[PDB]
Amino acid sequence: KAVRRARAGLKDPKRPIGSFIFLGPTGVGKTELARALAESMFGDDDAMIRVDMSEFMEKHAVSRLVGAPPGYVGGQLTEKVRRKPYSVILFDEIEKAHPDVFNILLQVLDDGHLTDTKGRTVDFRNTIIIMTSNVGAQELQDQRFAGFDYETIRKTMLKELKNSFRPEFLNRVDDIIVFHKLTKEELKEIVTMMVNKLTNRLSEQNINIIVTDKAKDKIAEEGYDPEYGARPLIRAIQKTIEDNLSELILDGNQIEGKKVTVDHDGKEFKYDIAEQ
Amino acid sequence: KAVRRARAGLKDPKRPIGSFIFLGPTGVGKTELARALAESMFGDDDAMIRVDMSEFMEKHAVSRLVGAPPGYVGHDDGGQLTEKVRRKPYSVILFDEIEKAHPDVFNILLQVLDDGHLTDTKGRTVDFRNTIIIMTSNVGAQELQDQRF
Amino acid sequence: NTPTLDSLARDLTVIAKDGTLDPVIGRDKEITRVIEVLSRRTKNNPVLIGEPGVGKTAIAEGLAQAIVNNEVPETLKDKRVMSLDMGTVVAGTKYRGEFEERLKKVMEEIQQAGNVILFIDELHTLVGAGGAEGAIDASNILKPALARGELQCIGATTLDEYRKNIEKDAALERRFQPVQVDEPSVVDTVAILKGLRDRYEAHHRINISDEAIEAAVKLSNRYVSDRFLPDKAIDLIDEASSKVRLKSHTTGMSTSLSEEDIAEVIAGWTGIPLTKINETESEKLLSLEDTLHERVIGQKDAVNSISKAVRRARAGLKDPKRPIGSFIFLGPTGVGKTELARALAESMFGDDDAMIRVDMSEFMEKHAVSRLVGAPPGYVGHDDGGQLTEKVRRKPYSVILFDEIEKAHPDVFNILLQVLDDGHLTDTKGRTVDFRNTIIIMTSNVGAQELQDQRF
Amino acid sequence: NNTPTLDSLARDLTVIAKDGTLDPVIGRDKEITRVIEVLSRRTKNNPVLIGEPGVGKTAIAEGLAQAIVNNEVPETLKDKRVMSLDMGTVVAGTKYRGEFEERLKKVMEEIQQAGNVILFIDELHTLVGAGGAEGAIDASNILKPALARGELQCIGATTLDEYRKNIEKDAALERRFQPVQVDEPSVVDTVAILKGLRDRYEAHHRINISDEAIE
Amino acid sequence: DKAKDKIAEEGYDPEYGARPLIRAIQKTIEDNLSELILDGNQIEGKKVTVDHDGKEFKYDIAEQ
Amino acid sequence: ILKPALARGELQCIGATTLDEYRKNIEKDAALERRFQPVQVDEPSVVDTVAILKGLRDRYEAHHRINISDEAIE
Numbered sequence A: 001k002a003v004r005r006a007r008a009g010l011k012d013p014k015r016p017i018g019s020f021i022f023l024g025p026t027g028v029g030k031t032e033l034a035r036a037l038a039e040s041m042f043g044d045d046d047a048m049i050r051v052d053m054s055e056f057m058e059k060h061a062v063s064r065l066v067g068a069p070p071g072y073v074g075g076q077l078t079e080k081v082r083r084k085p086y087s088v089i090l091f092d093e094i095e096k097a098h099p100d101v102f103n104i105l106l107q108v109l110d111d112g113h114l115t116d117t118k119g120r121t122v123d124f125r126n127t128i129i130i131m132t133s134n135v136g137a138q139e140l141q142d143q144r145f146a147g148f149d150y151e152t153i154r155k156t157m158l159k160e161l162k163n164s165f166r167p168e169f170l171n172r173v174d175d176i177i178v179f180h181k182l183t184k185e186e187l188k189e190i191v192t193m194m195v196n197k198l199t200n201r202l203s204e205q206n207i208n209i210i211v212t213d214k215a216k217d218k219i220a221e222e223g224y225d226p227e228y229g230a231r232p233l234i235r236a237i238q239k240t241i242e243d244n245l246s247e248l249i250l251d252g253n254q255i256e257g258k259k260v261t262v263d264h265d266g267k268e269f270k271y272d273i274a275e276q
Numbered sequence B: 001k002a003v004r005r006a007r008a009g010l011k012d013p014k015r016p017i018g019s020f021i022f023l024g025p026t027g028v029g030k031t032e033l034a035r036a037l038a039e040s041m042f043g044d045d046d047a048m049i050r051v052d053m054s055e056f057m058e059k060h061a062v063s064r065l066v067g068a069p070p071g072y073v074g075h076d077d078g079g080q081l082t083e084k085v086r087r088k089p090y091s092v093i094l095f096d097e098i099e100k101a102h103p104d105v106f107n108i109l110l111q112v113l114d115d116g117h118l119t120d121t122k123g124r125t126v127d128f129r130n131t132i133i134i135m136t137s138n139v140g141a142q143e144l145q146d147q148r149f
Numbered sequence C: 001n002t003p004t005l006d007s008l009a010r011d012l013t014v015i016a017k018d019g020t021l022d023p024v025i026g027r028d029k030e031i032t033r034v035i036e037v038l039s040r041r042t043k044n045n046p047v048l049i050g051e052p053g054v055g056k057t058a059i060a061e062g063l064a065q066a067i068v069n070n071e072v073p074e075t076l077k078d079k080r081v082m083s084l085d086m087g088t089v090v091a092g093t094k095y096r097g098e099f100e101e102r103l104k105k106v107m108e109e110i111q112q113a114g115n116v117i118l119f120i121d122e123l124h125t126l127v128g129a130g131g132a133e134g135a136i137d138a139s140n141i142l143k144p145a146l147a148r149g150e151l152q153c154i155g156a157t158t159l160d161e162y163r164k165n166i167e168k169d170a171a172l173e174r175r176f177q178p179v180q181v182d183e184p185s186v187v188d189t190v191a192i193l194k195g196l197r198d199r200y201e202a203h204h205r206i207n208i209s210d211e212a213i214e215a216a217v218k219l220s221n222r223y224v225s226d227r228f229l230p231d232k233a234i235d236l237i238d239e240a241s242s243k244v245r246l247k248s249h250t251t252g253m254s255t256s257l258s259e260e261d262i263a264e265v266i267a268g269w270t271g272i273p274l275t276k277i278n279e280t281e282s283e284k285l286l287s288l289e290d291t292l293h294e295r296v297i298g299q300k301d302a303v304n305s306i307s308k309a310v311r312r313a314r315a316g317l318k319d320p321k322r323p324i325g326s327f328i329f330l331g332p333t334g335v336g337k338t339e340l341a342r343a344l345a346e347s348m349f350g351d352d353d354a355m356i357r358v359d360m361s362e363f364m365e366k367h368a369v370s371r372l373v374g375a376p377p378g379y380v381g382h383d384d385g386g387q388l389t390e391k392v393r394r395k396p397y398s399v400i401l402f403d404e405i406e407k408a409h410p411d412v413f414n415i416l417l418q419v420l421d422d423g424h425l426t427d428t429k430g431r432t433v434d435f436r437n438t439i440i441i442m443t444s445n446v447g448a449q450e451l452q453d454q455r456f
Numbered sequence D: 001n002n003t004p005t006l007d008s009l010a011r012d013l014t015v016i017a018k019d020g021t022l023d024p025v026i027g028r029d030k031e032i033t034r035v036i037e038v039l040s041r042r043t044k045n046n047p048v049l050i051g052e053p054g055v056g057k058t059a060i061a062e063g064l065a066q067a068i069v070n071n072e073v074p075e076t077l078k079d080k081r082v083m084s085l086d087m088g089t090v091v092a093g094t095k096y097r098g099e100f101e102e103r104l105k106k107v108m109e110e111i112q113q114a115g116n117v118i119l120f121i122d123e124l125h126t127l128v129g130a131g132g133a134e135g136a137i138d139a140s141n142i143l144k145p146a147l148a149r150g151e152l153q154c155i156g157a158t159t160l161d162e163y164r165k166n167i168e169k170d171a172a173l174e175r176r177f178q179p180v181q182v183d184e185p186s187v188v189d190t191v192a193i194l195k196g197l198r199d200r201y202e203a204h205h206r207i208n209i210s211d212e213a214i215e
Numbered sequence E: 001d002k003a004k005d006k007i008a009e010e011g012y013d014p015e016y017g018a019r020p021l022i023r024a025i026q027k028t029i030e031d032n033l034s035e036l037i038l039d040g041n042q043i044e045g046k047k048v049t050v051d052h053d054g055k056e057f058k059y060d061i062a063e064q
Numbered sequence F: 001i002l003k004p005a006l007a008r009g010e011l012q013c014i015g016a017t018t019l020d021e022y023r024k025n026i027e028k029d030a031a032l033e034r035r036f037q038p039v040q041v042d043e044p045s046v047v048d049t050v051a052i053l054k055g056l057r058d059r060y061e062a063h064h065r066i067n068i069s070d071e072a073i074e
């Protein structure tokens, strides 16, 4: 919707295309969604401007954004945005910065302007700003009921965001989206996507793979862990698919140019080998 | 009333037209008021000399206001704010969100509010006596939110 | 005629007729922008902007070829491309007014000829060039002519030298039009190399195969992070060709490049083991657990996991987007885990000192994080850069040991998060260091004491 | 020879090698091979020798000069001249505008006309910013055009930290040199080195040096 | 006026002042106009009237 | 050399420079600064810019050999 408003010309000239906080559990596609947006707008993930806020644990690191004061030894963000004014900016995992680094963001969000230590103004008015976070996720496991869902999770995360960030910052964001924890069906679709991307990475090595739905479902149930989202699926793929193929191709290269089929027989994975 | 009092000629020559702290809850047009004043006085918002104090968090960033310290590389250039004011002595100056600056920045502002003069690090003195100085803040909003009854 | 200019400047048009200039491929959009700007009325001065090695000087050479080949609109069908090194202009102007007179003469000759397109490559040199205690620099002499359309002046410079030098002089900046030369894509780079190929075959006296072109582009794009695509792919093809020449020439005849001749060069540059797995290396990798148990007794599960990650990287199944492995080793004191990290480093490099080591017990204060990534711009020691970033950049295939992780301030590991997920860490200069080929081992003994002071 | 100004600014290492006064270079066959591979390149055929202080980089360039004299290099190099150029010598006596740019331009023309010269610039990090700054054009900017199209075959040596501090600040200059990593030799390699150098020290100190003294 | 009043209550949030009104204007007015104008340029040169019926906003297109 | 004549009124000398180069060069020599009177040329408005472009139009049409519409100016 924000991208369409920008392309329709309805977007207020004096403001960025959008500013979004992506909030949720760990391992839920919010940084992946930011990269997917960058790809959909520019054809590659590399076109995203990225700022990994954990580098900014201490206030004075803000000089990376706007440069060193006049006459002091030695801005990165200002130069990159001035070079590509139509771009996606990702401030990943905002809560790990020093709380008041984002005081610099305020003028960006309200005006779409930021001033460079050379006295030069850069206009973020055509950028999209995305800020991933997972405040509250630690508190969600500190919490235990000495006593006898989604909306309560949403509310407590939003409250912890209210605690961590000053009110005049949160007031400038155009939208604050909480991400749903993944369902097991969604995890099975993610397994299908990952297996596709593995297959067509390996195919240009001339290693041809197929994985049956039974095998993918076994992987999806092996990697299931709700508190960790999709990441434990990667580890399951590494253990099951990649380890045994690596053993085969190292042990006499017995796979190059052949076809490998992975299926699970109900007891264990099997790695049948055949010609095309 | 401050604008009208200055245009009537009754303003103290030694002082700026006005200095005002705008304070209160977020999203209440205290920045928009400064913008509207700038438009009413000059016909465009962009005539406002806007300074975003949230860049001045570290002590040494004050070099942007009055130039690099003596012997530093940019020392001959003078300050960016001093030169913008010297170039346009009738102007609205907005110090947005003052409380986010390092405390040391207000020591520079003191002589501006006291004599209407700012000494650039070159030693040149810039006269603010015809400017309007507006400072916005929202100190206490986090103290307001943790007022539980 | 232009008798001073002819002595000061190289004529690229005659050199293009001679034919020594290498061919330009695919850059039709940039050449079109250059033609559009040159056909302007008032400030027909394109400046080609981009990274080092992306091809800007090649764009100017391709424009000289296009003029010679009469592929240009009629207004350019008889134009001279003159490449004016400002060094040659400044050279020998010992006395007052000699530089100003020489450059004024050059401008007069350009004006009277009218058919010259000047090419001031390295345009950032033009600011202050020829200045002195009372001289007038080249920029202030050229400013009048650049703004009346009398000169047609192509320039080229890096983005950083543009910002640093000629965005200082805001009056000079106005007079040039930046044509952004982007880094070409993989497929564009393949086409570029195929077009250049004949020039390198004629030098090295070898056949350069298409799959070698594809290997060199893919590998140099994946593993050479400091340099940009066309230059570094040409570099990799040129060194692989030189290598196979040298090896065959000193004691069939139609020697041909191959993907392995490229892998050997890229492995020589980076130290990453990219050459084909021979049987000795494979037998060593398969017996890796046995080699690690020569120094670590027990701990079978850890040895297994480490060896499987090493095999998974050497096979080529590792996700390109992520480090080879990240491991936490957790357990009681005096039990193998640091010894296992050292055994792994020895098994991979023949020495324990090849391991990058970070003792987290000295990151007890949060602000110590500046050791990993450097001081912010403006603070003392900013020039020195990050110690971990420099060490990993200098040896991208290395074991990194983060020792005694629980003793560091809890926040300090937030810097690791991007390393573990992307395999990137950003140096405080803004340089990106890729950890994608490192193994990261973290060691801890949390809980292990509680497992003894638990008394039910 | 036909290069009358270069021969006054530089030292001909090839003749000094033919006079046998350069100490012998032992065991560095892989680095020498890499240098030969880079010099045989078509375009950016300039190696830069990178390593720690005292690992033996200048000794690599001298081993190359001796390889030239021994004609054991390929025919493409079999008659090259290695000329060590001190940048502090080039800037000597150049007070007036354009005098340094003229000197280095004439040097470059002489190199191009002779074609049989390999330039060696030890301590290459001095190259950037050499030649002053008050309206001067420094050596790096003068040489960048030639270094990228094969006219100059140039060998550099510098420490890792001076490379980082100086060369990589000018990434356009960085692109033009290929880093040849001069690793520290092993213990047994250093034993072989010292047993090779023995004769040169025995003659100077007029004493025998036992093997177990080397060990 | 009924549309303006509905926007003024959907955007009401007293701790955040006027800014949530902007988000409300964006969601209600600008989303649907951007859909209309991107879906076949059907707004250009025509008049649009926005009202609220007590269930939802309606976006009626007419000639001038 | 010129300070005497500029202060006497011997030369009717118009000059032009940017704000930055005025501040950097000729405000240092405060005696020379005194001899000149600054006329600030402000940036023209949007509508003034439209008028300027409609005035220049003939010169660009005759160069490019095309017609330039008013709405293209706007």
Ligand SMILES: Nc1ncnc2c1ncn2[C@@H]1O[C@H](COP(=O)(O)OP(=O)(O)OP(O)(O)=S)[C@@H](O)[C@H]1O
Pocket (backbone or CB within 6 Å): A025, A026, A027, A028, A029, A030, A031, A032, A033, A092, A093, A132, A133, A134, A190, A229, A230, A231
């Ligand atoms: N909903 C999803 N759809 C598809 N892939 C997903 C999804 N969630 C996670 N993934 C995959 O899981 C991996 C990690 O996803 P991320 O988006 O980085 O998790 P994240 O929570 O956004 O990371 P943070 O914000 O830095 S903690 C990637 O390989 C994604 O492709």
Ligand SMILES: Nc1ncnc2c1ncn2[C@@H]1O[C@H](COP(=O)(O)OP(=O)(O)OP(O)(O)=S)[C@@H](O)[C@H]1O
Pocket (backbone or CB within 6 Å): A110, A168, B025, B026, B027, B028, B029, B030, B031, B032, B033, B096, B097, B136, B137, B138, E017, E018, E019
């Ligand atoms: N009282 C008001 N009257 C009119 N418009 C207002 C008012 N308050 C806010 N606005 C509008 O809502 C937006 C935000 O107003 P601002 O004036 O920027 O809020 P602000 O509180 O002044 O900013 P702060 O203090 O730095 S968070 C602008 O588009 C204003 O036009």
Ligand SMILES: Nc1ncnc2c1ncn2[C@@H]1O[C@H](COP(=O)(O)OP(=O)(O)OP(O)(O)=S)[C@@H](O)[C@H]1O
Pocket (backbone or CB within 6 Å): C022, C023, C024, C025, C026, C027, C051, C052, C053, C054, C055, C056, C057, C058, C059, C156, C157, C158, C192, C195, C196, C230, C231, C234, D043, D144, D148, D172
């Ligand atoms: N489109 C192209 N077609 C053919 N060769 C190309 C092309 N683009 C780049 N090259 C080659 O890339 C190499 C380096 O390109 P250059 O244009 O010389 O570098 P550059 O961009 O001028 O870098 P600097 O820093 O400005 S000297 C040369 O060998 C060119 O032949």
Ligand SMILES: Nc1ncnc2c1ncn2[C@@H]1O[C@H](COP(=O)(O)OP(=O)(O)OP(O)(O)=S)[C@@H](O)[C@H]1O
Pocket (backbone or CB within 6 Å): C295, C296, C297, C298, C299, C331, C332, C333, C334, C335, C336, C337, C338, C339, C340, C443, C444, C445
């Ligand atoms: N399983 C083992 N096999 C062989 N040597 C071992 C083993 N465990 C410990 N050692 C030796 O004991 C010494 C100490 O081993 P360490 O690995 O440093 O202990 P540690 O577990 O690292 O202690 P912490 O957890 O870092 S406090 C070394 O000399 C090791 O060679």
Ligand SMILES: Nc1ncnc2c1ncn2[C@@H]1O[C@H](COP(=O)(O)OP(=O)(O)OP(O)(O)=S)[C@@H](O)[C@H]1O
Pocket (backbone or CB within 6 Å): D023, D024, D025, D026, D027, D028, D051, D052, D053, D054, D055, D056, D057, D058, D059, D060, D157, D158, D159, D193, D197
């Ligand atoms: N491979 C070698 N063969 C023979 N002698 C060597 C070798 N390596 C080093 N040496 C000797 O050890 C010393 C090394 O000095 P250098 O070669 O100048 O080292 P360096 O790295 O060039 O030091 P800098 O950087 O120039 S200060 C000299 O006395 C050399 O003769």
Ligand SMILES: [Mg+2]
Pocket (backbone or CB within 6 Å): A030, A031, A092, A093, A132, A133
């Ligand atoms: Mg994130």
Ligand SMILES: [Mg+2]
Pocket (backbone or CB within 6 Å): B030, B031, B096, B097, B136
């Ligand atoms: Mg404000």
Ligand SMILES: [Mg+2]
Pocket (backbone or CB within 6 Å): C056, C057, C121, C122, C156
């Ligand atoms: Mg060039």
Ligand SMILES: [Mg+2]
Pocket (backbone or CB within 6 Å): D057, D058, D122, D123, D157
């Ligand atoms: Mg040396």
